[PDB]
Amino acid sequence: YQYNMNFEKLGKCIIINNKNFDKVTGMGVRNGTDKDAEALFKCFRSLGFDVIVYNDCSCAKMQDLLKKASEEDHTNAACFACILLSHGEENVIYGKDGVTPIKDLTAHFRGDRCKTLLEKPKLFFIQACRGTELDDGIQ
Amino acid sequence: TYQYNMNFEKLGKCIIINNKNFDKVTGMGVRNGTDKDAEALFKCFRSLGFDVIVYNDCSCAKMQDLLKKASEEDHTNAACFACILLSHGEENVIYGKDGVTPIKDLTAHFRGDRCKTLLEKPKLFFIQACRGTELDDGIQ
Amino acid sequence: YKIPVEADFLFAYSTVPGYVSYRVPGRGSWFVQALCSILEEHGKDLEIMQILTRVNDRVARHFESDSDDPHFHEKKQIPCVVSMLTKELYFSQ
Amino acid sequence: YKIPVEADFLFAYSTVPGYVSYRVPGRGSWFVQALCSILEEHGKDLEIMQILTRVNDRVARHFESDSDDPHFHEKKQIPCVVSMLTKELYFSQ
Amino acid sequence: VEIX
Amino acid sequence: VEIX
Question: Site (Involved in allosteric regulation): which residue positions (chains C, D)?
Fold first, then answer.
């Protein structure tokens, strides 16, 4: 009933910390994201992840990063975690240069596309907007 | 304070929408098997303590109004609300016999600002429907 | 004092976005019949996410679509839980 | 014998579909700061859905926008957990 | 099996 | 507060 955590490693943790964006994108600097990223780094480090923080990544870069992790050998890892900190719209997230779909980033880890994380939890934590609606609250 | 408070006169309403037959114009088949779904579900949710109601072959207008009116009822002495949708579906959308209507519009009736008597109370939607056409092939 | 309007919803979809969901004319659909079976056994003692996670496991493991089956040769399905709940949910007491 | 390719994923979105998510230049974003604090206190002893549920609650309850805010004005946010997990997940043992 |  |  629980995932088996008896492994040499908890697993890899990728943190993508997009802060500064190309002016072509029209998007502001994401002030505050550094205090996020380093708070994230200690937490997931303290959990037991091997955390690496990449900054201001392009869409191609973001793709490459997850593609590469997809291709690593996770045989001795319990699980995988990826954390995305950026601007966003629904189903898509911003690189420095523009947008790329979240599905494409995560698809690399599908069971048929990453056999050493089969039956293993694959965790994506995403701090980004998903549209423009506001929630006004009540009570 | 880490669990929802379940001390209420009754657990709550369970609405089951059992769409089986569809208008030919929609191009959608009879959903053989859905009756056994619907029938396992009411027996099941009745046994938990819900006040279960089963609706059959609803139009989109029917589905909307029904959930709208349910939203507008008094849920003050109810712990929670459950709704189960059994129909054809495509991504973000679910079929009436008449055509399609979005899941968001159906559920929005119960938002905190639009159904104050289920405020701070769990609202459950169980959806048996397709969400697109992709197939999953498996692995190992 | 205030509460988000989209809060305290939970959505238990029979399948993941973009994908198909399976129904057996004799027996019923995989998701529902896995759902009920687990609720009949554990509805009264397990938290809602536990229940739905166990449902995820059974639909994923216990079900395939057979080889002689035309249209859809040995196919798989995984459900999809969307939780905006703010507390643990037990159906008792 | 087989397993769906979309299984065993979990997505912890900072917000629900269609909506915005908030960030404070001095302190950080609401979701991340709630996430970390809950992980800091409970990462090794609570199951992940419990963890993420508690995070939903804090973001839901502990945060507002004053009204003095020039653009947004007393707002609120609710995060969004999407689980295709098939087991309970604990980060220890 | 059939599909919804 | 800014939005992402």
Answer: 13
